[PDB]
Ligand binder design. Structure first.
Ligand SMILES: C/C(=C\CC/C(C)=C/COP(=O)(O)OP(=O)(O)O)CCC=C(CF)CF
Ligand SMILES: [Mg+2]
Ligand SMILES: [Mg+2]
Length: 280
C-alpha cells in the first residue's frame, strides 16, 4: 500500500471519551460490554479513517465506527440467518433516513438517527440525498445476505455490506468539504471507489480467516496489489478528469481533498488498523 499512514492528532482525547456517546444512547449497558467495546480499537480506526478531523468532527467519526460494530453484532446469531427478522430491524433503522423515529424504536436505531442528524447538518441537500442512498444500499445488503444464508456473486453483495462508502461519505462531512458531485459520479472516481471497497473486503476476509473459502490467500494478495497499482494509475487521470468537467479552483481543491482525506484514508487506515485490532 504505497499510501502514507496518518492518524488524527486528536486521537487520544477521542479514544478516551469514546464510551460516553453509546452509553447515553443505550447501546452499551454493562461495564463488560464497555470493555469489549474498548478492545475493538474503534476510535483508533476512526482517527485513521479521518486523520483530518479533530474535536466534534472526529467524535462523529468515532461514533460511526462504534455504531457500525454494535449494529453488525445484532446479526451474528439467529437473526442473521432469517431475512424476515433481519429486514424488520434494518427497516426500523433506515426509517431514520426519512424522518423522526418513534420513541419505541430500538436503541440501535436511535443511535443511527443521532449520527445521521449530525452527518447532514451543514451539507448540501444533494449530498445528503446521495449519502442516504448509500445507507439504503448498505441496509438492503444485510437483507440480501440473510436471504443467502437461509466470487462475482459474493462481491455484488459484499461490496454493499462492507460499509466502505458510508465511511468515505463521513470523511467529507468530517472534513467539511464535498467532492464535486459530477466528479463523484464520474467513471474514474467510481472505479477508484470500487477499488477502495474491494481492497477493504479482501483485507478483512484475510484478517477474519469469506472470499478465501469461496493458493487462495496468495491470489487475494495479488489482487490487492493489482488493484492498488490500478488505483495509482486512476489517480494520475484526475487532472484530466477535472478539465473534462471544467472544475474551477475551489472544485479542484475539493477533489484533491477527497482523494487524499477520503479515498486514500479508507484504503490505508483499514490496513493499519487490521494489523493491531482486538477483534482479530
Ligand atoms: C470499512 C469499515 C471497517 C473496516 C473493515 C471491517 C472491520 C469490516 C468488518 O468485517 P466483518 O466480517 O463484518 O466483521 P469482523 O470485523 O471481521 O469480525 C467500517 C464498516 C464496518 C462494518 C462492520 F462492523 C460494516 F458493518
Ligand atoms: Mg460480526
Ligand atoms: Mg470478515
Amino acid at each position: 500500500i504505497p499510501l502514507p499512514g496518518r492518524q488524527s492528532p486528536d486521537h487520544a482525547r477521542a479514544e478516551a471519551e469514546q464510551l460516553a456517546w453509546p452509553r447515553s444512547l443505550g447501546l452499551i449497558r454493562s461495564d463488560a460490554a464497555a470493555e469489549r467495546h474498548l478492545r475493538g480499537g474503534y476510535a483508533d480506526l476512526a482517527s485513521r479513517f479521518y486523520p483530518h478531523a479533530t474535536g466534534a468532527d472526529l467524535d462523529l467519526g468515532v461514533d460511526l465506527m462504534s455504531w457500525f460494530f454494535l449494529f453488525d453484532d445484532l446479526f451474528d446469531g439467529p437473526r442473521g440467518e432469517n431475512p424476515e427478522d433481519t429486514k424488520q430491524l434494518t427497516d426500523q433503522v433506515a426509517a431514520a433516513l426519512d424522518g423522526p423515529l418513534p420513541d419505541t424504536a430500538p436503541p440501535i436505531a436511535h443511535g443511527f438517527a443521532d449520527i445521521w442528524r449530525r452527518t447532514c447538518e451543514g451539507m448540501t441537500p444533494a449530498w445528503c440525498a446521495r449519502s442516504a442512498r448509500h445507507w439504503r444500499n448498505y441496509f438492503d445488503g444485510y437483507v440480501d445476505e440473510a436471504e443467502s444464508r437461509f466470487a462475482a456473486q459474493y462481491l455484488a453483495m459484499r461490496r454493499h455490506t462492507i460499509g466502505v462508502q458510508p465511511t468515505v461519505d463521513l470523511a467529507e462531512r468530517a472534513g467539511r468539504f464535498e467532492v464535486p458531485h459530477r466528479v463523484f459520479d464520474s467513471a474514474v472516481m467510481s472505479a477508484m471507489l470500487q477499488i477502495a471497497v474491494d481492497v477493504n473486503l479482501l483485507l478483512n476476509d484475510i484478517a477474519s480467516l469469506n472470499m478465501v473459502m469461496i493458493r487462495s490467500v496468495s491470489h487475494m494478495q495479488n489482487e490487492v496489489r493489482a488493484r492498488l497499482e490500478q488505483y495509482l494509475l486512476l489517480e494520475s487521470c484526475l487532472p484530466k478528469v477535472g478539465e473534462i468537467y471544467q472544475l474551477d479552483t475551489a472544485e479542484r481543491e475539493a477533489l484533491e481533498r477527497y482523494r487524499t482525506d477520503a479515498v486514500r484514508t479508507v484504503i490505508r487506515g483499514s490496513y493499519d488498523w487490521h494489523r493491531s485490532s482486538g477483534r482479530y
